[PDB]
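Backbone Fold Data
Goal — fold tokens
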Amino acid sequence: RRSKADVERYIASVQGSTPSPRQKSIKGFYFAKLYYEAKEYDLAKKYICTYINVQERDPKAHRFLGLLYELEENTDKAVECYRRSVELNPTQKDLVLKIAELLCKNDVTDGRAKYWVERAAKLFPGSPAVYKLKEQLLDCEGED
């Protein structure tokens, strides 16, 4: 049970001890996670963005922003964030499957779903999770 007031007290502590713009921004992942604990999703997005601005190559921060968008069923923004996270740390094979799953769940008509299913198939050979997506794509194929 974390309240808005609890998170504000921590932000105030940071402001009192490390008050520069970058110093406040570099605590923004902590602030975002605490607001998430406290169900303040808009504020969590605001603060993870301050952190990404000063630590742009941190793959965990884009992934967390992607998680926030995914929870809102904002497919395009979630995919954008997960794609950036993968680019920064491509050991996250899981995010390739996640992107394929999100696109297939949302809409299989702009063509991105096929692209990501193929990449996921390569990273997870024989995966039934991937085969389910390939079946869905085959079902919606047009006829010659």
About this structure: DSSP finds nine helices and no strands in the chain.
